[PDB]
Amino acid sequence: FTLIELLIVVAIIGILAAIAIPQFSAYRVKAYNSAASSDLRNLKTALESAFADDQTYPPES
Amino acid sequence: FTLIELLIVVAIIGILAAIAIPQFSAYRVKAYNSAASSDLRNLKTALESAFADDQTYPPES
């Protein structure tokens, strides 16, 4: 509308364009880690189930 | 739901994935042993029954 109105908008667009976007890197690597430790604690039950069938842990591959 | 909610889950999955799984090796070898000593104490009764039939322990094989 008025030149002064178009001077507040550009003064607010500048504000709302920098709101300290956080580093969402550590908060995701923790999920990838806790998939692998879960997966290992599960894998152990398969190994120690299979031993109590065969008196041996499985052959590799 | 919220990023903080997905930060407690990964903080608990990490806990419940390490609960000091014990070594269930000695607690099974004892069973295998007590099968063999039972089996021997039984085998002795067959030998010393067979003697009191024949005046001799059996021939081998």
Side-chain angles (χ1 to χ4, degrees):
Chain A
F1 186 13
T2 59
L3 190 67
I4 187 54
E5 177 167 305
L6 272 298
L7 268 168
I8 299 301
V9 168
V10 202
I12 291 183
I13 291 297
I15 288 308
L16 300 196
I19 61 171
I21 207 151
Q23 286 101 340
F24 285 151
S25 305
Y27 311 164
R28 186 174 60 220
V29 82
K30 289 167 64 81
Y32 294 142
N33 295 336
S34 297
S37 61
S38 163
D39 192 280
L40 170 60
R41 195 261 171 272
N42 214 305
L43 176 61
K44 191 182 297 193
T45 300
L47 291 178
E48 310 212 4
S49 181
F51 187 99
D53 295 346
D54 300 346
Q55 321 308 339
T56 178
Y57 297 107
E60 296 165 22
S61 300
Chain B
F1 186 13
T2 59
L3 190 67
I4 187 54
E5 177 167 305
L6 272 298
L7 268 168
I8 298 301
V9 168
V10 202
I12 291 183
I13 291 297
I15 288 308
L16 300 196
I19 61 171
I21 207 151
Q23 286 101 339
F24 285 151
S25 305
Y27 311 164
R28 186 174 60 220
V29 82
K30 289 167 64 80
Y32 294 142
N33 294 336
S34 297
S37 61
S38 163
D39 192 280
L40 170 60
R41 195 261 171 272
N42 214 305
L43 176 61
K44 191 182 297 193
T45 300
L47 291 178
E48 310 212 4
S49 181
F51 187 99
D53 295 346
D54 300 346
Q55 321 308 339
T56 178
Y57 297 107
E60 296 165 22
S61 300

